[PDB]
Design an enzyme around this catalytic site. Sequence first.
Site, PDB file in Angstrom:
ATOM      1  N   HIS A  44      -0.869   1.119   0.612  1.00  0.00           N
ATOM      2  CA  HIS A  44       0.353   0.150   0.844  1.00  0.00           C
ATOM      3  C   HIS A  44      -0.231  -1.065   1.233  1.00  0.00           C
ATOM      4  O   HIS A  44       0.326  -2.244   1.046  1.00  0.00           O
ATOM      5  CB  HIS A  44       0.950   0.895   1.954  1.00  0.00           C
ATOM      6  CG  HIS A  44       2.205   0.103   2.271  1.00  0.00           C
ATOM      7  ND1 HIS A  44       3.442   0.337   2.040  1.00  0.00           N
ATOM      8  CD2 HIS A  44       2.320  -1.027   3.081  1.00  0.00           C
ATOM      9  CE1 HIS A  44       4.321  -0.335   2.458  1.00  0.00           C
ATOM     10  NE2 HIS A  44       3.735  -1.262   3.259  1.00  0.00           N
ATOM     11  N   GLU A  45      -1.216  -1.217   2.456  1.00  0.00           N
ATOM     12  CA  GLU A  45      -1.486  -2.525   2.892  1.00  0.00           C
ATOM     13  C   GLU A  45      -2.446  -3.336   1.775  1.00  0.00           C
ATOM     14  O   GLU A  45      -2.303  -4.277   1.785  1.00  0.00           O
ATOM     15  CB  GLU A  45      -2.620  -2.135   4.261  1.00  0.00           C
ATOM     16  CG  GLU A  45      -1.706  -1.415   5.363  1.00  0.00           C
ATOM     17  CD  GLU A  45      -0.294  -2.186   5.585  1.00  0.00           C
ATOM     18  OE1 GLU A  45      -0.524  -3.295   5.580  1.00  0.00           O
ATOM     19  OE2 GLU A  45       0.432  -1.304   6.166  1.00  0.00           O
TER      20      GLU A  45
ATOM     21  N   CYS B 198       8.424  -0.704   4.744  1.00  0.00           N
ATOM     22  CA  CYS B 198       7.877  -1.958   4.895  1.00  0.00           C
ATOM     23  C   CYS B 198       8.221  -2.551   6.129  1.00  0.00           C
ATOM     24  O   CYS B 198       9.422  -2.786   6.082  1.00  0.00           O
ATOM     25  CB  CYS B 198       7.561  -2.499   3.620  1.00  0.00           C
ATOM     26  SG  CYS B 198       6.436  -4.001   3.722  1.00  0.00           S
ATOM     27  N   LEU B 199       7.296  -3.236   6.937  1.00  0.00           N
ATOM     28  CA  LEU B 199       8.080  -4.287   7.998  1.00  0.00           C
ATOM     29  C   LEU B 199       8.531  -5.217   7.396  1.00  0.00           C
ATOM     30  O   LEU B 199       9.363  -6.329   7.764  1.00  0.00           O
ATOM     31  CB  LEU B 199       7.127  -4.449   9.036  1.00  0.00           C
ATOM     32  CG  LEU B 199       6.727  -3.138   9.715  1.00  0.00           C
ATOM     33  CD1 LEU B 199       5.435  -3.663  10.729  1.00  0.00           C
ATOM     34  CD2 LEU B 199       7.860  -2.743  10.747  1.00  0.00           C
TER      35      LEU B 199
ATOM     36  N   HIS C 269      -0.371  -5.378  -0.457  1.00  0.00           N
ATOM     37  CA  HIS C 269      -0.024  -6.763   0.204  1.00  0.00           C
ATOM     38  C   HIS C 269      -0.869  -7.701  -0.179  1.00  0.00           C
ATOM     39  O   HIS C 269      -0.464  -8.955  -0.281  1.00  0.00           O
ATOM     40  CB  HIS C 269       0.188  -6.625   1.574  1.00  0.00           C
ATOM     41  CG  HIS C 269       1.563  -6.068   2.195  1.00  0.00           C
ATOM     42  ND1 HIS C 269       2.786  -6.724   1.667  1.00  0.00           N
ATOM     43  CD2 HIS C 269       1.808  -4.899   2.942  1.00  0.00           C
ATOM     44  CE1 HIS C 269       3.775  -5.729   2.058  1.00  0.00           C
ATOM     45  NE2 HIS C 269       3.379  -4.929   2.982  1.00  0.00           N
TER      46      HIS C 269
ATOM     47  N   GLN D   4       1.728 -10.841   5.472  1.00  0.00           N
ATOM     48  CA  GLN D   4       2.874 -10.638   6.394  1.00  0.00           C
ATOM     49  C   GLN D   4       3.057 -11.231   7.604  1.00  0.00           C
ATOM     50  O   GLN D   4       4.339 -11.534   7.915  1.00  0.00           O
ATOM     51  CB  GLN D   4       3.050  -8.992   6.672  1.00  0.00           C
ATOM     52  CG  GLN D   4       2.916  -7.959   5.587  1.00  0.00           C
ATOM     53  CD  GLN D   4       3.127  -6.701   5.926  1.00  0.00           C
ATOM     54  OE1 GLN D   4       2.059  -5.887   6.373  1.00  0.00           O
ATOM     55  NE2 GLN D   4       4.232  -6.088   5.885  1.00  0.00           N
TER      56      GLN D   4
ATOM     57  N   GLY E 179       0.366   0.122   9.832  1.00  0.00           N
ATOM     58  CA  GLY E 179      -0.315  -0.733   9.384  1.00  0.00           C
ATOM     59  C   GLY E 179       0.226  -2.236   9.214  1.00  0.00           C
ATOM     60  O   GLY E 179       1.482  -2.327   9.343  1.00  0.00           O
TER      61      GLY E 179
HETATM   62  C1  LIG Z   1       3.891   5.108   4.963  1.00  0.00           C
HETATM   63  C2  LIG Z   1       2.946   3.960   4.216  1.00  0.00           C
HETATM   64  C3  LIG Z   1       3.040   2.612   4.773  1.00  0.00           C
HETATM   65  C4  LIG Z   1       2.594   2.346   6.156  1.00  0.00           C
HETATM   66  C5  LIG Z   1       2.862   0.893   6.914  1.00  0.00           C
HETATM   67  C6  LIG Z   1       4.150   0.524   7.110  1.00  0.00           C
HETATM   68  C7  LIG Z   1       3.932  -0.822   7.813  1.00  0.00           C
HETATM   69  C8  LIG Z   1       3.872  -2.022   6.814  1.00  0.00           C
HETATM   70  O1  LIG Z   1       4.927  -2.693   6.366  1.00  0.00           O
HETATM   71  N1  LIG Z   1       2.810  -2.219   6.557  1.00  0.00           N
HETATM   72  O2  LIG Z   1       2.489  -3.373   5.338  1.00  0.00           O
HETATM   73  C9  LIG Z   1       4.791   1.330   8.080  1.00  0.00           C
HETATM   74  O3  LIG Z   1       4.241   1.751   9.114  1.00  0.00           O
HETATM   75  N2  LIG Z   1       5.745   2.023   7.529  1.00  0.00           N
HETATM   76  C10 LIG Z   1       6.460   3.071   8.341  1.00  0.00           C
HETATM   77  C11 LIG Z   1       6.758   4.242   7.278  1.00  0.00           C
HETATM   78  O4  LIG Z   1       7.119   4.154   6.410  1.00  0.00           O
HETATM   79  N3  LIG Z   1       6.632   5.790   8.008  1.00  0.00           N
HETATM   80  C12 LIG Z   1       6.266   5.813   9.397  1.00  0.00           C
HETATM   81  C13 LIG Z   1       5.878   7.188   9.245  1.00  0.00           C
HETATM   82  C14 LIG Z   1       6.214   7.819   7.958  1.00  0.00           C
HETATM   83  C15 LIG Z   1       6.847   6.678   6.962  1.00  0.00           C
HETATM   84  C16 LIG Z   1       8.540   6.831   6.721  1.00  0.00           C
HETATM   85  O5  LIG Z   1       8.564   8.009   6.066  1.00  0.00           O
HETATM   86  C17 LIG Z   1       7.658   2.663   9.082  1.00  0.00           C
HETATM   87  C18 LIG Z   1       7.557   1.857  10.383  1.00  0.00           C
HETATM   88  C19 LIG Z   1       8.651   1.751   8.203  1.00  0.00           C
HETATM   89 FE   LIG Z   2       4.107  -3.144   4.075  1.00  0.00          FE
END
Ligand SMILES: CCCCC[C@H](CC(=O)NO)C(=O)N[C@H](C(=O)N1CCC[C@H]1CO)C(C)C
Ligand SMILES: [Fe+2]
Length: 161
Positions: free
Chosen positions: A133-134, A91-92, A137, A52, A47
Amino acid sequence: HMIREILKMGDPRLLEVARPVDRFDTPELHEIVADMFETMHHANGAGLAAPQIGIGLQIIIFGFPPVPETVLINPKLEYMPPDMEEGWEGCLSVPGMRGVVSRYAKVRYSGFDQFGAKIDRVAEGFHARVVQHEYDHLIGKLYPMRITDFTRFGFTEVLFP
Ligand SMILES: CCCCC[C@H](CC(=O)NO)C(=O)N[C@H](C(=O)N1CCC[C@H]1CO)C(C)C
Ligand SMILES: [Fe+2]
Protein backbone atom coordinates in the site's frame (compact mmCIF):
# COMPACT_ATOMS: atom_id res chain seq x y z
CA HIS A 1 8.08 17.31 15.53
CA MET A 2 5.25 18.86 13.47
CA ILE A 3 1.94 17.51 12.18
CA ARG A 4 1.64 18.05 8.42
CA GLU A 5 -1.52 18.15 6.31
CA ILE A 6 -2.29 14.83 4.60
CA LEU A 7 -3.21 15.34 0.94
CA LYS A 8 -6.52 13.95 -0.26
CA MET A 9 -7.33 11.95 -3.39
CA GLY A 10 -7.84 14.39 -6.22
CA ASP A 11 -4.64 16.22 -5.39
CA PRO A 12 -2.41 15.69 -8.47
CA ARG A 13 0.66 15.36 -6.26
CA LEU A 14 -0.65 11.94 -5.20
CA LEU A 15 -0.43 10.76 -8.82
CA GLU A 16 3.22 11.64 -9.46
CA VAL A 17 6.11 9.20 -9.33
CA ALA A 18 8.32 9.98 -6.33
CA ARG A 19 12.03 10.76 -6.88
CA PRO A 20 14.82 8.85 -5.10
CA VAL A 21 16.57 10.19 -2.03
CA ASP A 22 20.21 10.91 -2.93
CA ARG A 23 21.72 11.97 0.41
CA PHE A 24 21.26 10.14 3.71
CA ASP A 25 21.77 11.27 7.33
CA THR A 26 20.96 14.94 6.75
CA PRO A 27 19.08 17.20 9.18
CA GLU A 28 16.48 17.81 6.48
CA LEU A 29 15.84 14.10 6.00
CA HIS A 30 15.65 13.54 9.76
CA GLU A 31 12.97 16.25 10.03
CA ILE A 32 10.91 14.69 7.22
CA VAL A 33 10.98 11.30 8.96
CA ALA A 34 10.01 12.92 12.28
CA ASP A 35 7.19 14.88 10.61
CA MET A 36 5.89 11.69 8.97
CA PHE A 37 5.78 9.73 12.25
CA GLU A 38 3.94 12.52 14.08
CA THR A 39 1.47 12.94 11.22
CA MET A 40 0.99 9.15 11.07
CA HIS A 41 0.51 8.70 14.82
CA HIS A 42 -1.90 11.63 14.92
CA ALA A 43 -4.14 9.72 12.50
CA ASN A 44 -3.73 6.21 14.01
CA GLY A 45 -2.20 5.13 10.70
CA ALA A 46 -0.20 1.95 10.20
CA GLY A 47 1.96 3.54 7.47
CA LEU A 48 2.61 6.79 5.63
CA ALA A 49 4.34 7.80 2.40
CA ALA A 50 6.08 11.15 1.82
CA PRO A 51 3.90 12.16 -1.18
CA GLN A 52 0.89 12.13 1.20
CA ILE A 53 2.40 15.10 3.01
CA GLY A 54 3.37 16.70 -0.30
CA ILE A 55 6.98 15.52 -0.35
CA GLY A 56 7.73 13.87 -3.67
CA LEU A 57 10.46 11.53 -2.36
CA GLN A 58 10.67 7.72 -2.10
CA ILE A 59 10.22 7.56 1.70
CA ILE A 60 7.72 5.32 3.45
CA ILE A 61 7.29 4.55 7.16
CA PHE A 62 5.23 1.87 8.85
CA GLY A 63 4.94 0.02 12.09
CA PHE A 64 1.82 -0.70 14.09
CA PRO A 65 2.18 -10.31 14.33
CA PRO A 66 3.96 -7.07 15.23
CA VAL A 67 4.88 -4.96 12.21
CA PRO A 68 8.40 -3.61 12.88
CA GLU A 69 8.75 0.15 13.15
CA THR A 70 10.52 1.01 9.95
CA VAL A 71 11.78 3.83 7.75
CA LEU A 72 12.20 2.53 4.18
CA ILE A 73 13.87 4.80 1.61
CA ASN A 74 14.20 4.10 -2.11
CA PRO A 75 12.25 0.84 -1.70
CA LYS A 76 12.66 -2.04 -4.11
CA LEU A 77 9.79 -4.53 -3.94
CA GLU A 78 9.62 -8.06 -5.30
CA TYR A 79 6.15 -9.56 -5.65
CA MET A 80 5.91 -13.30 -4.99
CA PRO A 81 3.19 -14.91 -7.18
CA PRO A 82 0.86 -16.59 -7.21
CA ASP A 83 -0.68 -16.40 -3.74
CA MET A 84 -2.98 -13.34 -3.39
CA GLU A 85 -5.19 -12.32 -0.48
CA GLU A 86 -8.19 -10.00 -0.40
CA GLY A 87 -8.56 -7.61 2.51
CA TRP A 88 -10.12 -4.35 3.63
CA GLU A 89 -7.97 -1.23 3.25
CA GLY A 90 -8.40 2.40 4.14
CA CYS A 91 -6.14 5.32 3.26
CA LEU A 92 -5.44 8.53 5.12
CA SER A 93 -5.75 10.22 1.69
CA VAL A 94 -9.22 8.68 1.14
CA PRO A 95 -10.75 9.61 4.53
CA GLY A 96 -14.00 7.93 5.52
CA MET A 97 -13.88 4.91 3.19
CA ARG A 98 -12.82 1.25 2.96
CA GLY A 99 -12.46 -1.11 0.01
CA VAL A 100 -11.44 -4.71 -0.56
CA VAL A 101 -8.09 -4.99 -2.35
CA SER A 102 -6.18 -8.07 -3.56
CA ARG A 103 -2.52 -8.03 -2.51
CA TYR A 104 0.38 -10.43 -2.77
CA ALA A 105 0.42 -12.58 0.35
CA LYS A 106 4.22 -12.26 0.45
CA VAL A 107 6.75 -9.70 -0.84
CA ARG A 108 10.45 -9.05 -0.49
CA TYR A 109 11.50 -5.46 0.09
CA SER A 110 14.82 -3.69 0.37
CA GLY A 111 16.07 -0.14 0.59
CA PHE A 112 17.75 2.08 3.17
CA ASP A 113 16.95 3.71 6.51
CA GLN A 114 17.42 7.45 7.06
CA PHE A 115 21.06 6.78 7.99
CA GLY A 116 21.72 4.92 4.73
CA ALA A 117 21.93 1.49 6.37
CA LYS A 118 20.60 -1.32 4.20
CA ILE A 119 17.17 -2.89 4.84
CA ASP A 120 16.32 -6.27 3.33
CA ARG A 121 13.32 -8.37 4.41
CA VAL A 122 10.63 -10.83 3.34
CA ALA A 123 7.15 -9.92 4.59
CA GLU A 124 3.85 -11.85 4.88
CA GLY A 125 0.18 -10.99 5.34
CA PHE A 126 -0.66 -7.62 6.89
CA HIS A 127 3.01 -6.62 7.02
CA ALA A 128 3.27 -7.27 3.29
CA ARG A 129 -0.05 -5.51 2.68
CA VAL A 130 1.06 -2.30 4.39
CA VAL A 131 4.32 -2.29 2.44
CA GLN A 132 2.46 -2.75 -0.87
CA HIS A 133 0.00 0.00 0.00
CA GLU A 134 2.73 2.51 0.88
CA TYR A 135 4.87 1.54 -2.10
CA ASP A 136 1.88 2.21 -4.36
CA HIS A 137 1.87 5.80 -3.09
CA LEU A 138 5.42 6.24 -4.44
CA ILE A 139 4.34 5.21 -7.94
CA GLY A 140 1.17 7.33 -8.13
CA LYS A 141 -1.34 4.64 -7.10
CA LEU A 142 -4.12 4.90 -4.52
CA TYR A 143 -6.00 1.76 -3.50
CA PRO A 144 -9.25 2.49 -5.47
CA MET A 145 -7.10 2.01 -8.60
CA ARG A 146 -6.48 -1.58 -7.48
CA ILE A 147 -10.12 -2.39 -6.66
CA THR A 148 -11.89 -4.83 -8.96
CA ASP A 149 -15.10 -5.34 -6.98
CA PHE A 150 -16.71 -1.94 -6.35
CA THR A 151 -19.67 -3.48 -4.58
CA ARG A 152 -17.19 -3.87 -1.71
CA PHE A 153 -16.14 -0.23 -1.57
CA GLY A 154 -17.89 2.37 0.55
CA PHE A 155 -18.00 4.45 3.69
CA THR A 156 -16.52 3.01 6.88
CA GLU A 157 -19.46 4.15 9.02
CA VAL A 158 -21.82 2.11 6.82
CA LEU A 159 -19.66 -0.97 6.22
CA PHE A 160 -18.42 -1.29 9.83
CA PRO A 161 -20.92 0.44 12.23
C1 LIG B 1 -4.28 -1.77 5.56
C2 LIG B 1 -3.31 -1.33 4.50
C3 LIG B 1 -3.03 0.16 4.54
C4 LIG B 1 -2.26 0.61 5.77
C5 LIG B 1 -1.91 2.09 5.77
C6 LIG B 1 -3.11 3.04 5.98
C7 LIG B 1 -2.57 4.46 6.14
C8 LIG B 1 -2.20 5.12 4.83
O1 LIG B 1 -3.00 5.81 4.20
N1 LIG B 1 -0.96 4.89 4.43
O2 LIG B 1 -0.55 5.30 3.16
C9 LIG B 1 -3.83 2.64 7.24
O3 LIG B 1 -3.26 2.61 8.33
N2 LIG B 1 -5.12 2.30 7.08
C10 LIG B 1 -5.89 1.78 8.19
C11 LIG B 1 -6.57 0.47 7.75
O4 LIG B 1 -6.88 0.30 6.59
N3 LIG B 1 -6.76 -0.48 8.68
C12 LIG B 1 -6.37 -0.42 10.10
C13 LIG B 1 -6.16 -1.86 10.46
C14 LIG B 1 -7.19 -2.61 9.62
C15 LIG B 1 -7.40 -1.77 8.35
C16 LIG B 1 -8.86 -1.58 7.98
O5 LIG B 1 -9.53 -2.82 7.84
C17 LIG B 1 -6.90 2.81 8.73
C18 LIG B 1 -6.22 3.79 9.66
C19 LIG B 1 -7.60 3.56 7.60
FE1 LIG C 1 -2.55 5.30 1.93
